[PDB]
Design an enzyme around this catalytic site. Structure first.
Site, PDB file in Angstrom:
ATOM      1  N   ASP A 200     -32.137 -15.568  20.783  1.00  0.00           N
ATOM      2  CA  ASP A 200     -32.695 -16.826  20.635  1.00  0.00           C
ATOM      3  C   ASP A 200     -31.538 -17.965  20.901  1.00  0.00           C
ATOM      4  O   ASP A 200     -30.528 -18.216  19.798  1.00  0.00           O
ATOM      5  CB  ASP A 200     -33.233 -17.104  19.024  1.00  0.00           C
ATOM      6  CG  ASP A 200     -33.890 -18.453  18.877  1.00  0.00           C
ATOM      7  OD1 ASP A 200     -33.960 -19.231  20.026  1.00  0.00           O
ATOM      8  OD2 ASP A 200     -34.422 -18.521  17.905  1.00  0.00           O
ATOM      9  N   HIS A 356     -23.013 -18.291  16.627  1.00  0.00           N
ATOM     10  CA  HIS A 356     -23.179 -18.189  18.038  1.00  0.00           C
ATOM     11  C   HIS A 356     -21.829 -18.756  18.737  1.00  0.00           C
ATOM     12  O   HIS A 356     -21.408 -19.690  17.944  1.00  0.00           O
ATOM     13  CB  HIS A 356     -24.453 -18.804  18.488  1.00  0.00           C
ATOM     14  CG  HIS A 356     -25.432 -18.015  18.707  1.00  0.00           C
ATOM     15  ND1 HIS A 356     -25.895 -16.761  19.692  1.00  0.00           N
ATOM     16  CD2 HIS A 356     -26.825 -17.882  18.088  1.00  0.00           C
ATOM     17  CE1 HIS A 356     -27.205 -16.291  19.398  1.00  0.00           C
ATOM     18  NE2 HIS A 356     -27.606 -16.798  18.356  1.00  0.00           N
ATOM     19  N   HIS A 390     -25.363 -12.652  18.509  1.00  0.00           N
ATOM     20  CA  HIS A 390     -25.600 -11.372  18.162  1.00  0.00           C
ATOM     21  C   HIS A 390     -25.004 -10.502  19.313  1.00  0.00           C
ATOM     22  O   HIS A 390     -25.588  -9.799  20.224  1.00  0.00           O
ATOM     23  CB  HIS A 390     -27.193 -11.102  18.525  1.00  0.00           C
ATOM     24  CG  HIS A 390     -28.057 -11.695  17.456  1.00  0.00           C
ATOM     25  ND1 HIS A 390     -27.919 -11.728  16.282  1.00  0.00           N
ATOM     26  CD2 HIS A 390     -28.855 -12.801  17.674  1.00  0.00           C
ATOM     27  CE1 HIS A 390     -28.893 -12.538  15.550  1.00  0.00           C
ATOM     28  NE2 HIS A 390     -29.338 -13.275  16.554  1.00  0.00           N
ATOM     29  N   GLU A 415     -30.494  -6.929  22.250  1.00  0.00           N
ATOM     30  CA  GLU A 415     -31.765  -7.762  21.722  1.00  0.00           C
ATOM     31  C   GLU A 415     -32.937  -7.655  22.791  1.00  0.00           C
ATOM     32  O   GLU A 415     -32.705  -8.209  23.810  1.00  0.00           O
ATOM     33  CB  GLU A 415     -31.544  -9.164  21.050  1.00  0.00           C
ATOM     34  CG  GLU A 415     -32.937  -9.869  21.018  1.00  0.00           C
ATOM     35  CD  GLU A 415     -32.804 -10.815  19.963  1.00  0.00           C
ATOM     36  OE1 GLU A 415     -31.733 -11.258  19.440  1.00  0.00           O
ATOM     37  OE2 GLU A 415     -33.762 -11.466  19.659  1.00  0.00           O
ATOM     38  N   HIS A 417     -36.199  -8.650  21.799  1.00  0.00           N
ATOM     39  CA  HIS A 417     -37.372  -9.312  20.926  1.00  0.00           C
ATOM     40  C   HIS A 417     -38.506  -9.503  21.761  1.00  0.00           C
ATOM     41  O   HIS A 417     -39.586  -9.497  21.368  1.00  0.00           O
ATOM     42  CB  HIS A 417     -36.938 -10.492  20.437  1.00  0.00           C
ATOM     43  CG  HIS A 417     -37.286 -11.115  19.144  1.00  0.00           C
ATOM     44  ND1 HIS A 417     -36.879 -12.292  18.481  1.00  0.00           N
ATOM     45  CD2 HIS A 417     -38.832 -10.722  18.818  1.00  0.00           C
ATOM     46  CE1 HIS A 417     -37.799 -12.536  17.476  1.00  0.00           C
ATOM     47  NE2 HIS A 417     -38.924 -11.541  17.672  1.00  0.00           N
ATOM     48  N   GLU A 460     -33.171  -7.540  16.458  1.00  0.00           N
ATOM     49  CA  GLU A 460     -34.536  -7.616  16.874  1.00  0.00           C
ATOM     50  C   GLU A 460     -35.216  -6.866  17.995  1.00  0.00           C
ATOM     51  O   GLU A 460     -35.422  -7.417  18.977  1.00  0.00           O
ATOM     52  CB  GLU A 460     -34.728  -9.175  16.724  1.00  0.00           C
ATOM     53  CG  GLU A 460     -34.747 -10.028  15.653  1.00  0.00           C
ATOM     54  CD  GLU A 460     -35.099 -11.342  15.651  1.00  0.00           C
ATOM     55  OE1 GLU A 460     -34.589 -12.215  16.657  1.00  0.00           O
ATOM     56  OE2 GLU A 460     -36.020 -11.462  14.896  1.00  0.00           O
ATOM     57  N   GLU A 536     -29.905 -12.226   7.532  1.00  0.00           N
ATOM     58  CA  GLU A 536     -30.206 -13.657   7.796  1.00  0.00           C
ATOM     59  C   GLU A 536     -31.055 -14.251   6.637  1.00  0.00           C
ATOM     60  O   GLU A 536     -31.979 -13.429   6.363  1.00  0.00           O
ATOM     61  CB  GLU A 536     -30.964 -13.834   9.030  1.00  0.00           C
ATOM     62  CG  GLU A 536     -30.269 -13.421  10.503  1.00  0.00           C
ATOM     63  CD  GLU A 536     -31.123 -13.620  11.773  1.00  0.00           C
ATOM     64  OE1 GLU A 536     -32.015 -14.574  11.684  1.00  0.00           O
ATOM     65  OE2 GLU A 536     -30.838 -13.032  12.776  1.00  0.00           O
ATOM     66  N   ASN A 596     -40.452 -23.314  27.021  1.00  0.00           N
ATOM     67  CA  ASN A 596     -39.144 -23.555  26.257  1.00  0.00           C
ATOM     68  C   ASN A 596     -39.623 -23.548  24.703  1.00  0.00           C
ATOM     69  O   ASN A 596     -40.849 -23.696  24.401  1.00  0.00           O
ATOM     70  CB  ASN A 596     -38.407 -24.737  26.482  1.00  0.00           C
ATOM     71  CG  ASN A 596     -39.053 -26.075  26.255  1.00  0.00           C
ATOM     72  OD1 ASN A 596     -38.987 -26.599  25.203  1.00  0.00           O
ATOM     73  ND2 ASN A 596     -39.604 -26.407  27.289  1.00  0.00           N
ATOM     74  N   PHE A 600     -35.946 -25.426  18.455  1.00  0.00           N
ATOM     75  CA  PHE A 600     -35.912 -24.460  17.622  1.00  0.00           C
ATOM     76  C   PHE A 600     -34.327 -23.887  17.903  1.00  0.00           C
ATOM     77  O   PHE A 600     -33.931 -22.878  17.027  1.00  0.00           O
ATOM     78  CB  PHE A 600     -36.742 -23.538  17.996  1.00  0.00           C
ATOM     79  CG  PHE A 600     -36.910 -22.218  16.752  1.00  0.00           C
ATOM     80  CD1 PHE A 600     -37.527 -22.564  15.640  1.00  0.00           C
ATOM     81  CD2 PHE A 600     -36.534 -21.063  16.931  1.00  0.00           C
ATOM     82  CE1 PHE A 600     -37.595 -21.796  14.480  1.00  0.00           C
ATOM     83  CE2 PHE A 600     -36.703 -20.174  15.745  1.00  0.00           C
ATOM     84  CZ  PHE A 600     -37.233 -20.571  14.552  1.00  0.00           C
ATOM     85  N   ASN A 603     -30.284 -24.792  14.322  1.00  0.00           N
ATOM     86  CA  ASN A 603     -30.590 -24.421  13.070  1.00  0.00           C
ATOM     87  C   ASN A 603     -29.389 -24.369  12.378  1.00  0.00           C
ATOM     88  O   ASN A 603     -29.133 -23.736  11.274  1.00  0.00           O
ATOM     89  CB  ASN A 603     -31.077 -22.836  13.086  1.00  0.00           C
ATOM     90  CG  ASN A 603     -32.141 -22.696  14.335  1.00  0.00           C
ATOM     91  OD1 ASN A 603     -31.870 -21.517  14.942  1.00  0.00           O
ATOM     92  ND2 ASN A 603     -33.181 -23.364  14.436  1.00  0.00           N
TER      93      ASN A 603
HETATM   94  O1  LIG Z   1     -32.121 -13.229  14.790  1.00  0.00           O
HETATM   95  C1  LIG Z   1     -31.882 -14.871  15.165  1.00  0.00           C
HETATM   96  O2  LIG Z   1     -31.466 -14.834  16.262  1.00  0.00           O
HETATM   97  C2  LIG Z   1     -33.399 -15.252  15.067  1.00  0.00           C
HETATM   98  N1  LIG Z   1     -34.145 -15.154  13.791  1.00  0.00           N
HETATM   99  C3  LIG Z   1     -34.485 -16.727  13.253  1.00  0.00           C
HETATM  100  C4  LIG Z   1     -33.726 -17.424  13.928  1.00  0.00           C
HETATM  101  O3  LIG Z   1     -34.014 -18.761  14.213  1.00  0.00           O
HETATM  102  C5  LIG Z   1     -33.491 -16.850  15.344  1.00  0.00           C
HETATM  103  O4  LIG Z   1     -34.500 -17.048  16.309  1.00  0.00           O
HETATM  104 MG   LIG Z   2     -34.725 -13.012  18.554  1.00  0.00          MG
HETATM  105 NA    NA Z   3     -33.753 -20.532  16.419  1.00  0.00          NA
END
Ligand SMILES: OC(O)[C@H]1NC[C@H](O)[C@@H]1O
Ligand SMILES: [Mg+2]
Ligand code: NA
Ligand SMILES: OC(O)[C@H]1NC[C@H](O)[C@@H]1O
Ligand SMILES: [Mg+2]
Ligand SMILES: [Mg+2]
Ligand SMILES: [Mg+2]
Ligand code: NA
Ligand code: NA
Ligand code: NA
Lengths: 1016, 206, 204
Positions: A200, A356, A390, A415, A417, A460, A536, A596, A600, A603
Site C-alpha cells: 500500500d 515507509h 514492508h 507482499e 495482497h 499480507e 500494525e 486509485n 488512503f 495515514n
Molecule cells: O499493511 C499495511 O501496509 C496496510 N494495512 C492497513 C494500512 O492502511 C495499509 O494499507
Molecule cells: Mg497491503
Molecule cells: Na493506507
C-alpha cells in the site's frame, strides 16, 4: 555482438519469468568499503576504493522495451535528457505515479506483465583509472532499482536483476577499459517481481538508490558474521567473528579481528584460515572463526546504544595488510523466554511505528537528512522501535538506528495482497525461488546490525508453505533473532510472535479463516504461549488515534502484551503545483492514475514535510517512560526504563487555580530502571476563591542529548486537587414584541429572535451586528476518514458512520418550529423555544431551549435534546453560528493547547491557553472536522465570552465547506468566524479506518442530553 | 528420496548451506513430492543423501512437513539426528560399538536411542554393507531390532551389484566394474555391493 | 530465427548456472493420461491421448555443444546413427561410462563444468493428427534426461531442463504442425545439476 543486442537480450523476456530473478549477479553480503588502511576502517573514513556514481546521468523514457533503438547500446540518444540519480522518473514527469492499495496496477495474470511496460533507459559516461584495471576486482553496486533491469558496460551485456529493495552487484572487471566507459541500464517498471511488491504505497520506478563502484583485491574478504554470546548476568561476552575469503589460499594468509571501544582497543584475535571439522569431508578451508573475549561489556539498547567498532584485517603473516572491513558492534541478546520477548534479560515494551521510505518531493529516494529528522522526531515522541514496512530500507537507516538507539524489524520485500486468495503465490513451489531470494539476501545484508532485533517474512501474503520454509531457513542461519510474520491469521507456524494487525483491546472480530480476536483473549486461547506484539495498530488516517490510551493500559497490565507498531509514521502525499506555482499536497488520483485509492496513502502521525499531526502528542504521552500516581500530597514516579537510571531528568510541578498559578517547584529525579521514587510535595496553597485546583507535573531533561534539545519535556501528568464550589450569588432588559421577531434591549446591547425560525438571528453591540448566520442546533460533523470507513475506493461499507448518517437524513434534516414564546421576569427576559428535526416525516431530534437574558447583559442558554433511539447516534449535539468578527487570538480555559477529542484527550492538560486563530484549525490534507478542544469552561474570542462545560472548535471554514472540499488547498476562508459549541461530541475511533471503530461508551447513545452555556 | 547428493564437496554441506543453491535444491524436493504424493507405498520422504547438513535441508524439511504432513521426513546428512529429520537414520552404525568421529559420531544404535533429549525412532538408512562375501554379523542387528522397540529396522546396502557386461575377443560376456572402460580416476569394484548379481542371481548372503 | 540458433541459445550457458534450472517447463503433477471416457480410466486402459515416442531415434555424439553444426536444428545429420530410446549413450559405445564413488568426475569448480562436455544430439521425425492441433493442449513429457538438455520443435527453441530423475514437460501447441514434425534434443553430460548428482554409481 549479436548476443549483446536488444533483440537477443529482450527476447527471452526475463521479467516475465519467476524462475529467473537475476543473471550474473554477485552473492549478497554485509556492507563493504575495502579499506586498504586499518586506521581509515576503524575511524570509518571514506574509502578510496568505493566510488559513488551518483550525479548527472542521461535518461530517455520509452513506452515499452521494444521501442528502445539499438543505437542506445553504443552511444547516447540525442533525445535523452540529463537527470539526477538516484531518483524516481515519475518525480520528473515522465509518466505518472500510481497510488493503489490492494488492487495491482497491472492485469493480474502472473507471471506476465503488460506489453505497455514503461522503460527507463539510463546511461553514464565515466572514467576508471588504469590501477583499478591492472589488478583486483571491480564491481558495480546498484542499491535499489525499481523494478527490474538489464545492464550493459561498453555495449556488452552484463546481467539482470529484480528485487527493487536490495542491492544488486555485478563484476565489471572484464568489461571496463582505461579512459572512457559507458554504462547503459534499461529499467522496466513492471515485471514478475512486481507481483511480490503489492505494498500500500505509491508505485514508482527507476534507479532510486545509490550506484557505486567498489574495487577489491583478488584475494579478498567475501563475508563476515559477528555474533555476541553472554553469561547469565551479562558480565562476560564472547564476540565470535566468522570471516570468509575468496581468491587463492596461501599459507601466509592471516585474519586479524580487533574490537575497539572508541579509541581503546578492547580485544583482538589473529589466526590463519581453517574452520573446525564440519562433517565427514572436513571443514571450510576458506573460513576462520575468531573468538574474542570481552569483560564487562557495555550493552547496546535503545535506551543506551553503546557501540563498539570491529575491524577485520586480511593480511600476510609478515604483517602486510591486504584488505580491511568493519562494522559497528552492539552487545545485546534478543530472546523469547517463557512467552516474553527479552532484550538483555529484560522484557521489552515496544513503543513502535511503521515507517515507509517517502519524501513528498523525491518520492522514494531517501537521504540522510530526512532519516535523521525522522529518528529525532520519533525518539523525541517516545518511540523506541520502527518496522520497515514492508521492505529492506536504505543501508544507512540501520547505521542510524544503531547509533541513535531504535529497535528495528527488518522485513523482506514480499507482499502479494492483490492475489485471490492471498497465498496463491506463497503456497506455490514455483515462486519459492523468487521468495527465497528476497528473504535470504536481506538476512545476508543486514545480520550484523545490532538495531535489527526481529526478522519479518513480508506482509499480507496469506500463509503458504513457502513462508514456513523461509521461516525455518532464518531460524537455522540466524538463531539470534526471532522471526515474525502476520499473514494467514498472525499466529501461524511461520511466526515466533503473535503479530496481528488492528486487533482491538476488548472486542473480537470473528472473520472466517483469519479471526482478529481481542488482544487480551488471544493470549489465553488453549495452547497459545507466544508474546503478542501488534505489527500494525491505531491506524492514524487523518484525525484519528481515538482509543490509543486503551491499548497502552492493556500493554502495561498484561505481561505478554509487549506493545506494537502504530500505522504509521508519515503521510504518503506528493507535492503538485497550481497554475501560479503554489505547491499543494496531493494524494491518490491527483496524477491521472486510475484506478486509485484516493486519500488512503496518507495515514501518518506527521505530514509529509514532517510537521506533526495532533495525534503524535497523544502517542508521546501514552508511550512516556515515567508513570505517575498521586495519593494525597505524595507523587509516585515509576520508571519504565529497563536499563538506564534517570540521570537527565528534572521533575517540575505546578498547582494552578483555573489557570492561575499558585505554587510550583522542582525536584531532580533519581529512580532506577523499573524502580520508584516518592516525591512529597509541600503543604499546598489552600485558596479562598472558588474553583478547581489542578496539579501538573512534567519531567524535563536539562541537558541535551544526541536526539533532543536541552529542556526537552519527556513525560507529564495532571490531576484535580481540592475543589471549592462557588456559593456566591451574582437594569431590566426590555422585551419588544413584533409579529416577526422578539427584540430585547439592555443599554447598548440588543438581541433579536426570529419568530418564524425560532433562533437567535442577530445581536448588536451598539450599532455593530455580531452574527452573520443565526445561532442554531447542529447534530453533524464534516466526516472524518474514520467516519467514511473506506480502505479500497471501489468498496463502500453500509455500516460506516457516514453512510448511516446520510441514509438517515442527518445531513438534510429540517427543523420544524414547535414553540417560540417570550416573557418578562422580575429581572430578566426569558425566551423559550422547541424545534423538531425531521427527514421524510421521521422526527430525528427534538431540541428545547430557554434563553434567559438578565440585567447584567448575560445570556444563559439551556438546551435539552431528545434523540430517536432507532436513528444512528449523532456525531455531535451542540450549537453553531457564524460570527461577524474575525479576531487574531483565541483564549480559553480548558484542555490542552492542541486539538483533542473525547476519544483522544489524555495528552492534553487543563489550563488557560492562548493561540492564534490559525492554530485552532488542523490542516489535514483531506479536510474534515478538526480542531476541537474538549473540557472547556470558558472561551474568549473578540468581545465575546462563553462559559459552561463544552467542547468547541473555531475557524474560518464551515462544516459544509469541510465536507464538500476534497483537498485542503481548495479551502477558502469564509466571511466571518464559524463557532461550533458542542455540549456532547462523538469519539473519533481509529482502531482501523475501514470499519466502525468508536467504542460504545464514546457514542452519543443516551437518548436525552442537557447542556447550558452563558454568552456575553 | 530427492535427487540431491553432494558427497564430493569439501566440506559436504558447501552447497547445501549456501542460499544461492537453495532454488536448485528446492526444485528437486518439491517436484518429487508433487509427482509422487498420491502413492500409498511411499510412506517416508528423504531429502537426498550425503550432503552434510545445511540450512537448505532445514528449509526443505519444513516445506514437506507443511505441504504433506501425512508422511515423516528423514535425512541422514550431518550426523543422522539433525533437525532436518524425524527419524534417526544413520548409515553403518554398529549394534554395540561406537564410532566417535569428530563432528559426525556414529554411536552404537542401542546407545543412540538413550542419549539425553533423544526421543525419535531409529531406522538405519544403510547397514550391513553387502560388498562381495559379506553380511557377517547380520543376526546381531536383528536380535537388536526385535529386543529394542525404538529400533525399527533398516535398509541393507544394497540390492543388486552395479556391474556392466563387456565382451572378450571371442564374444564371451564378462561382468565389468570400475576402470574396465578406461574411466580414470575410478573406484574399482566398489560399485558392486549387492545381495544379488546384476543378472539377479542371488549371492549367498541373501 | 536468429534467437532459435545454437550460437544464441548456447551462449547464455544455462548448464553453468544454478539460478537457471529450467526454461518454459510446465508445473509438476501426479501422472496423467487424460482419458476421455470414465470407464477406460477406471479399468486403467491405455489412453489414446498419451502417445509413447519411444522407439528408433536419430543420434549423433559430439565432444562439446559448440561442435554441433547449425544444420542439425533443421535437418537430420548424415553422420547420425539410429538408436533406441530410452537408452544411455555409453551403453552404445559413444563414450565411456565412469564409475566414481565420492570424487566428482569433473573438476570441482561450481557452478562451472568443463569445456569438453559430451553432447548427445537426439532427433525424431513424427506425425501429429490435425485433431490434436485443432483444439486443446499438446505437451511433450521427458521422464528422465541426464543431465541437462535444450529442446527444439521444428527448428524453434522450446526450453531447457536439468533434473535427471524427474519428468520435464513442455507445451508444444504453438510449435507443432499437421503432418511431419521433428524434435531436436541436445543432451549435455555435465552441468551445474551434476554437482547435486554425486551418487556412488556409474555416471552415464
Ligand atoms: O499493511 C499495511 O501496509 C496496510 N494495512 C492497513 C494500512 O492502511 C495499509 O494499507
Ligand atoms: Mg497491503
Ligand atoms: Na493506507
Ligand atoms: O550412500 C551410499 O550411496 C554409499 N554409502 C556406502 C555405499 O557403498 C555407498 O557408497
Ligand atoms: Mg524473472
Ligand atoms: Mg542451470
Ligand atoms: Mg556418496
Ligand atoms: Na507487557
Ligand atoms: Na523394534
Ligand atoms: Na559402493
Amino acid at each position: 555482438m549479436i548476443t549483446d543486442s536488444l533483440a537477443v537480450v529482450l527476447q527471452r523476456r526475463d521479467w516475465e519469468n519467476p524462475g529467473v530473478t537475476q543473471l550474473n549477479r554477485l552473492a549478497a553480503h554485509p556492507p563493504f568499503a575495502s579499506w586498504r588502511n586499518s586506521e581509515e576502517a576503524r575511524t570509518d573514513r571514506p574509502s578510496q576504493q568505493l566510488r559513488s556514481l551518483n550525479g548527472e546521468w542521461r535518461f530517455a523514457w520509452f513506452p515499452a522495451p521494444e521501442a528502445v533503438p539499438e543505437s542506445w547500446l553504443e552511444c547516447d540518444l540525442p533525445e535523452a535528457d540529463t537527470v539526477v540519480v538516484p531518483s524516481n522518473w515519475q518525480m520528473h514527469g515522465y509518466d505518472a505515479p500510481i497510488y493503489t492499495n490492494v488492487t495491482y496496477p497491472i492485469t493480474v495474470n502472473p507471471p506476465f506483465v503488460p506489453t505497455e511496460n514503461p522503460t527507463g533507459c539510463y546511461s553514464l559516461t565515466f572514467n576508471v583509472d588504469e590501477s583499478w584495471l591492472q589488478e583486483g576486482q571491480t564491481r558495480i553496486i546498484f542499491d535499489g532499482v525499481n523494478s527490474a533491469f538489464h545492464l550493459w558496460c561498453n555495449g556488452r551485456w552484463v546481467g539482470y536483476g529484480q528485487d527493487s529493495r536490495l542491492p544488486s552487484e555485478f563484476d565489471l572487471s572484464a568489461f571496463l577499459r582505461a579512459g572512457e566507459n559507458r554504462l547503459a541500464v534499461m529499467v522496466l517498471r513492471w515485471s514478475d517481481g512486481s507481483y511480490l511488491e503489492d505494498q500500500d504505497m505509491w508505485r514508482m520506478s527507476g534507479i532510486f538508490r545509490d550506484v557505486s563502484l567498489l574495487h577489491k583485491p583478488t584475494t579478498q574478504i567475501s563475508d563476515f558474521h559477528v555474533a555476541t554470546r553472554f553469561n547469565d548476568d551479562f558480565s562476560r561476552a564472547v564476540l565470535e567473528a566468522e570471516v570468509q575469503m575468496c581468491g587463492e589460499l596461501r599459507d601466509y594468509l592471516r585474519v586479524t579481528v580487533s574490537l575497539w571501544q572508541g579509541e581503546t582497543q578492547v580485544a583482538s584475535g589473529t589466526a590463519p584460515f581453517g574452520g573446525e571439522i564440519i562433517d565427514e569431508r572436513g571443514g571450510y578451508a576458506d573460513r576462520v572463526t575468531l573468538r574474542l573475549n570481552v569483560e564487562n561489556p557495555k550493552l547496546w539498547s535503545a535506551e543506551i546504544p553503546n557501540l563498539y567498532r570491529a575491524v577485520v584485517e586480511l593480511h600476510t603473516a609478515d604483517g602486510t595488510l591486504i584488505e580491511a572491513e568493519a562494522c559497528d558492534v552492539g552487545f545485546r541478546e534478543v530472546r523469547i523466554e517463557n512467552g516474553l520477548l527479552l532484550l538483555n534479560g529484560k522484557p521489552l515494551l515496544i513503543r513502535g511505528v511503521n515507517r515507509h521510505e517517502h519524501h513528498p518531493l523525491h518520492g522514494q529516494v531517501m537521504d540522510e537528512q530526512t532519516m535523521v529528522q525522522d529518528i529525532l522526531l520519533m525518539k523525541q515522541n517516545n518511540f523506541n522501535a520502527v518496522r520497515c514496512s514492508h521492505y529492506p530500507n536504505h543501508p544507512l537507516w540501520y547505521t542510524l538506528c544503531d547509533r541513535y538507539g531504535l529497535y528495528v524489524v527488518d522485513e523482506a520485500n514480499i507482499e502479494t495482497h492483490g492475489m485471490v486468495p492471498m497465498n496463491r503465490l506463497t503456497d506455490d513451489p514455483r515462486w519459492l525461488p523468487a521468495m527465497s531470494e528476497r528473504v535470504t539476501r536481506m538476512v545476508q545484508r543486514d545480520r550484523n546490525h545490532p538495531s535489527v532485533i526481529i526478522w519479518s517474512l513480508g506482509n499480507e501474503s496469506g500463509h503458504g508453505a513457502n513462508h514456513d520454509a523461509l521461516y525455518r531457513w532464518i531460524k537455522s542461519v540466524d538463531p539470534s533473532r526471532p522471526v515474525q510474520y502476520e499473514g494467514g491469521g498472525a499466529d501461524t507456524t511461520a511466526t515466533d510472535i503473535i503479530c496481528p494487525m488492528y486487533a482491538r483491546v476488548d472486542e473480537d472480530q470473528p472473520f472466517p479463516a483469519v479471526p482478529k480476536w481481542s488482544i487480551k483473549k488471544w493470549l489465553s486461547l488453549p495452547g497459545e504461549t507466544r508474546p503478542l506484539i501488534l505489527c500494525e495498530y491505531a491506524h492514524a488516517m487523518g484525525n484519528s488515534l481515538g482509543g490509543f490510551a486503551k491499548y497502552w493500559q492493556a500493554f502495561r497490565q498484561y505481561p505478554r502484551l509487549q506493545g506494537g507498531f502504530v500505522w504509521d509514521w508519515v503521510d504518503q502525499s506528493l507535492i503538485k503545483y497550481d497554475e501560479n506555482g503554489n505547491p499543494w499536497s496531493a494524494y491518490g488520483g491527483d496524477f491521472g492514475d486510475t484506478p486509485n485509492d484516493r486519500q488512503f496513502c496518507m495515514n501518518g502521525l506527521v505530514f509529509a514535510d514532517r510537521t506533526p499531526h495532533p495525534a503524535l502528542t497523544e502517542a508521546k504521552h501514552q508511550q512516556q517512560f515515567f508513570q505517575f500516581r498521586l495519593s494525597g500530597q505524595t507523587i509516585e514516579v515509576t520508571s519504565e526504563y529497563l536499563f538506564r537510571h534517570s540521570d537527565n531528568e528534572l521533575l517540575h510541578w505546578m498547582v494552578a487555580l483555573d489557570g492561575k498559578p499558585l505554587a510550583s517547584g522542582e525536584v531532580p529525579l533519581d529512580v532506577a530502571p523499573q524502580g520508584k521514587q516518592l516525591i512529597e510535595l509541600p503543604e499546598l496553597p489552600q485558596p479562598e476563591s472558588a474553583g478547581q485546583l489542578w496539579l501538573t507535573v512534567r519531567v524535563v531533561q536539562p541537558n541535551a542529548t544526541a536526539w533532543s534539545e536541552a529542556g526537552h519535556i519527556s513525560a507529564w501528568q495532571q490531576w484535580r486537587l481540592a475543589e471549592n464550589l462557588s456559593v456566591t450569588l451574582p437594569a431590566i432588559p426590555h422585551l419588544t414584541t413584533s409579529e416577526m421577531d422578539f427584540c430585547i434591549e439592555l443599554g447598548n446591547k440588543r438581541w433579536q429572535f426570529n419568530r418564524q425560525s425560532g433562533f437567535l438571528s442577530q445581536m448588536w453591540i451598539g450599532d455593530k451586528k455580531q452574527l452573520l448566520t443565526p445561532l442554531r442546533d447542529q447534530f453533524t460533523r464534516a466526516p472524518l476518514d474514520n467516519d467514511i470507513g473506506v480502505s479500497e475506493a471501489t468498496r463502500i461499507d453500509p455500516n460506516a458512520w457516514v453512510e448511516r448518517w446520510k441514509a438517515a437524513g442527518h445531513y438534510q434534516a429540517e427543523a420544524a418550529l414547535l414553540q417560540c414564546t417570550a416573557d418578562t421576569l422580575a429581572d430578566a427576559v426569558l425566551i423559550t423555544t422547541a424545534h423538531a428535526w425531521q427527514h421524510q416525516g421521521k422526527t430525528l431530534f427534538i431540541s428545547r431551549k430557554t434563553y434567559r437574558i438578565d440585567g447584567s447583559g448575560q445570556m444563559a442558554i439551556t438546551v435539552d435534546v431528545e434523540v430517536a433511539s432507532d436513528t444512528p447516534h449523532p456525531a455531535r449535539i451542540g450549537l453553531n453560528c457564524q460570527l461577524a468578527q474575525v479576531a487574531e487570538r483565541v483564549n480559553w480555559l480548558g484542555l490542552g493547547p492542541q486539538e483533542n477529542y473525547p476519544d483522544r484527550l489524555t495528552a492534553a492538560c487543563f489550563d488557560r491557553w492562548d493561540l492564534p486563530l490559525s492554530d485552532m484549525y488542523t490542516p489535514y490534507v483531506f479536510p474534515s472536522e478538526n480542531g476541537l478542544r474538549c473540557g472547556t469552561r470558558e472561551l474568549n474570542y473578540g468581545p465575546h465570552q462563553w462559559r459552561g462545560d463544552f467542547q468547541f472548535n473555531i475557524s474560518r471554514y464551515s462544516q459544509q465547506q469541510l465536507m464538500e472540499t476534497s483537498h485542503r488547498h481548495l479551502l477558502h476562508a469564509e466571511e466571518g468566524t464559524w463557532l461550533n459549541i458542542d455540549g456532547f461530541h462523538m469519539g473519533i475511533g481509529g482502531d482501523d479506518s475501514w470499519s466502525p471503530s468508536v467504542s460504545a461508551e464514546l457514542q452519543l447513545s443516551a437518548g436525552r442530553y442537557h447542556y447550558q452555556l452563558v454568552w456575553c
